[PDB]
Amino acid sequence: YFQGAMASTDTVTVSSPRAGLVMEKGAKVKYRGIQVGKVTDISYSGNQARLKLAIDSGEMGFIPSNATVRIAGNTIFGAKSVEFIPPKTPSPKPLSPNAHVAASQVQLELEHH
Amino acid sequence: STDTVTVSSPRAGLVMEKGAKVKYRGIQVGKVTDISYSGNQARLKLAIDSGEMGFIPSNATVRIAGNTIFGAKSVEFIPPKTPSPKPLSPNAHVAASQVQLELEHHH
């Protein structure tokens, strides 16, 4: 390898115990209250998700090699598709070019496996 | 050319693969382009073909199939029982067994 210009960071990977995890935009990495990096990439392969972190070079000298990872978050609805359903009594006027579908007209269903 | 249709979500915690397909009676009519989260409400921004909205009635409902997944927000390294003197090595990998998924509190 060759020495970088400045602001060098080291990459570290994290395996997700639950597949299908998603990461929020601009997620940070902390250690004892201090931000030490950020989450750059996230790849799905089969039934496992891996996270790629970017910790500062100087900050990784303080994290023990036997430390654990704690990921906070909430359960959300991960949707894959959107489908319009023909109503029981359809309207003559088609969908207008600038239409809005109210939330009461939306049906959230769980997929089958 | 495409036209934009917006859709409100019954759940604020809704994510979607970018460029997910929008279908009507088996055939694809467009794709979702963006999701706006103003406040605690989610609004989908669809983009469907111009010649496809003539077949979709104005009073058509929307079905969205998906799964309940974990929406991570932050990653934190936790000091162990007894920290080892050797620091984290570059390109190290922490296995899924050493990962703890916790739900955050809400007031």
Residue numbers in the entry:
A (entry chain B): 32 to 144
B (entry chain A): 39 to 145
Study authors write:
Despite extensive trials, only MtMce4A39–140 crystallized readily in several conditions in space group P65. The structure was refined at 2.9 Å resolution. The domain-swapped dimer is formed by the extension of residues 107–141 from one molecule into the other molecule. The swapped region contains two β-strands and an extended loop [Fig. 3(a)]. The residues from 107 to 141 are exchanged between the two monomers to complete the signature MCE fold. In comparison to the homologs from E. coli (EcMlaD, EcPqiB and EcLetB) and A. baumannii MlaD (AbMlaD), the overall MCE fold with a seven-stranded β-barrel is conserved in the domain-swapped dimer of MtMce4A39–140. The dimer appears to be selectively crystallized, for example favored by better crystal contacts, compared with the monomer.
The mammalian cell entry genes (mceA–mceF) encode the substrate-binding proteins of the lipid-transporting Mce complexes in mycobacteria. In terms of lipid transport in Mtb, Mce proteins are characterized as ABC transporters. It is now well demonstrated that Mce1 is involved in the transport of mycolic acid/fatty acids and Mce4 imports cholesterol. A common feature of each of these proteins is that they all contain a conserved domain of approximately 100 residues, now referred to as the MCE domain, which is characterized by a seven-stranded β-barrel fold, although the sequence identity of these domains is very low.
